[PDB]
Design a protein around this ligand. Structure first.
Ligand SMILES: Nc1nc2c(ncn2[C@@H]2O[C@H](COP(=O)(O)OP(=O)(O)OP(=O)(O)O)[C@@H](O)[C@H]2O)c(=O)[nH]1
Ligand SMILES: [Mg+2]
Length: 342
């Protein structure tokens, strides 16, 4: 039972408290499908020009957390694959921004590579337009606007990650029952095969839960950083590489922290920067924007060693709760320790 051991159990409670809550989780797909419907409407510049709409990033791998700087807002990443004449990356973003004009949300913000839709309830959407470039699903490019195209295959990365993280029945059933119970909902499933469709699995894998805690640790250590932060797709890639069936949560969290820290250390030893290719599309590097310098990567490695070393000292819990507050956030740790008390 993932709640039997005290350290594994408090980490599980922490992970439950950073998930996309069930009520919002149940709205996410319809939300982005409504965006697609809007940009496909008559008069839109992108009328007839949308090939497909798909989640990328955390939503593609059931890894969504509260967004950096907050405990109660969430960002979802959606790709709009666009067809027709290619007149450059800036014009592609221009078309997407124009198609999203007057969309009834709190605010629409044009970013360097995407258009952001901020929603009143705190679950936001980043819409990245893409151009398909090759037959493989879904090998192509995204705009950066000098303006340039950037190769990517986030679709195949998501599928690759999911293949490495098959649902772990005992773990998933236990953590989902608690996630839903905290939200006032009866999650009633004896087996992962016949979960009631009204209460689907949100949590599926110890590997992903550890990855969510890695991202939370990152979000706390860089909560107010306005510069570049360690990228989640690099962390998600390493989590996929580190995936091991049947591992306990603390053990896996230590393993993933040391995976990234040691990879950084080995590059730094050579005066080189961390390099992490897309397993499904090796010309794409998940390290193309980060790290920019030795200081950046070695700073993050030091944070990761501190996390791994403290969790390992705990395996070998009132002093631990204070240390956890510094690593994962005061309020979320307080809420989790309360649940573990009962
Ligand atoms: N190659 C590359 N892709 C990126 C980079 N940043 C974002 N992406 C792509 O955009 C997707 C969404 O980015 P993120 O929001 O940072 O990833 P995430 O897994 O959703 O992480 P969280 O939002 O922190 O939960 C990623 O899965 C990547 O496909 C980057 O620096 N390099
Ligand atoms: Mg994201």
């Amino acid at each position: 039972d993932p709640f039997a051991d005290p350290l594994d159990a408090v980490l599980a409670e922490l992970a439950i408290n950073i998930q996309l809550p069930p009520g919002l989780h149940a709205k996410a797909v319809e939300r982005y499908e409504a965006v697609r419907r809007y940009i496909e409407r008559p008069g839109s510049p992108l009328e007839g020009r949308v090939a497909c709409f798909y989640p990328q990033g955390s939503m593609a791998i059931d890894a969504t957390t509260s967004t950096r700087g907050t405990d109660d807002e969430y960002d979802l990443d959606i790709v709009a694959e666009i067809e027709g004449p290619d007149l450059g990356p800036e014009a592609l973003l221009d078309d997407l921004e124009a198609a999203l004009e007057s969309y009834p949300v709190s605010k629409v913000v044009r970013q360097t590579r995407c258009i952001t839709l901020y929603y009143a309830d705190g679950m936001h959407l980043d819409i990245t337009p893409s151009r398909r470039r090759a037959p493989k699903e879904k090998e192509g490019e995204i705009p950066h606007a000098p303006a340039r195209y950037v190769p990517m295959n986030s679709y195949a990365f998501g599928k690759w990650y999911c293949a490495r993280t098959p649902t772990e029945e005992r773990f998933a059933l236990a953590l989902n029952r608690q996630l839903y119970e905290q939200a006032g909902i009866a999650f009633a499933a004896a087996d992962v095969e016949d979960v009631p469709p009204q209460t689907p699995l949100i949590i599926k894998s110890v590997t992903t839960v550890a990855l969510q805690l890695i991202k939370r640790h990152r979000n706390i250590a860089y909560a107010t950083e306005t510069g570049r932060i360690p990228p989640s797709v690099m962390l998600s890639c390493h989590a996929g590489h580190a995936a091991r069936p049947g591992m306990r949560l603390a053990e896996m969290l230590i393993r993933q922290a040391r995976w990234t820290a040691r990879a950084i250390d080995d590059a730094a030893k050579r005066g080189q920067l961390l390099v992490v290719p897309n397993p499904e599309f090796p010309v794409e590097r998940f390290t193309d924007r980060w790290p920019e310098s030795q200081l950046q990567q070695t700073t993050y490695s030091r944070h990761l060693h501190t996390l791994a070393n403290g969790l390992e000292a705990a395996r070998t819990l009132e002093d631990l709760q204070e240390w956890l507050r510094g690593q994962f956030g005061d309020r979320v740790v307080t809420r989790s320790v309360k649940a573990f008390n009962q």
